[PDB]
Amino acid sequence: MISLIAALAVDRVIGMENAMPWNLPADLAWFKRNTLDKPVIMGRHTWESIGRPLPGRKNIILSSQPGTDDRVTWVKSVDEAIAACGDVPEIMVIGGGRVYEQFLPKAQKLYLTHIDAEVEGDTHFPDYEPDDWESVFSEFHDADAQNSHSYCFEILERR
């Protein structure tokens, strides 16, 4: 099964041209904990912004163009991305917007970080219907000396 993992601000904003104006080490620890040892599928832009292969995981980058880093796996389509994952318990799709859009319809689980932040952005997580998902886990956190905003981690299973 396929899972999508994303950090969302108000209005489902997930990205913009510049760096997001927040500091959330807690979300990154959560992202790492949930993706370690699993294949992670990302779009070329996310790859670019991550900047290096993520350690301890099989990195698969979607691009219409030839790959420029032999350390990772480049694919030209959804289906190839999937086949490149092999026979594994769970595949993690890490972004970005165009990628989430194509994978949502095939995902069985959502790992979301809701951030209490109003940011202007040009990329959004796709619209999803709460009633199609069962919130199986949730945990609210206030901002602290390390985290600039309050956030909440939620795990949804498709009904």
Ligand X SMILES: NC(=O)c1ccc[n+]([C@@H]2O[C@H](COP(=O)([O-])OP(=O)(O)OC[C@H]3O[C@@H](n4cnc5c(N)ncnc54)[C@H](OP(=O)(O)O)[C@@H]3O)[C@@H](O)[C@H]2O)c1
Residues lying near ligand MTX in the complex (CB under 6 A) are found at: 5-7, 27-29, 31-32, 46, 49-50, 54, 94-95, 113
Q: How far apart are the C-alpha atoms of 144 and 157, rounded to whole Å?
A: 29
Nearest to 144 by CA among 26, 21, 7, 28: 26
Question: Which of ligand MTX, ligand X, none does residue 65 bind (CB under 5 to 8 Å by kind)?
Answer: ligand X
User: From the list ligand MTX, ligand X, none, which binds 84 (C-beta under 5 to 8 Å, kind-based)?
Assistant: none
Strand order in the sheet with 109-115: 73-75, 58-62, 39-43, 91-95, 2-8, 109-115, 151-158, 133-141
Of 82 and 143, which has the nearer Cβ to ligand X? 82
Report if residue 15 touches ligand X, rule: CB under 6 A.
yes
Q: Which of 97, 121, 149, 155 binds ligand X (CB under 6 A)?
A: 97
Among 21, 56, 68, 76, binds ligand X (CB under 6 A): 76
- The reply to whether 114 sits in an annotated binding site is no
Helices (H) and strands (E) in the chain, counts: 4, 10
Is the CB of 6 or the CB of 9 nearer to ligand MTX? 6
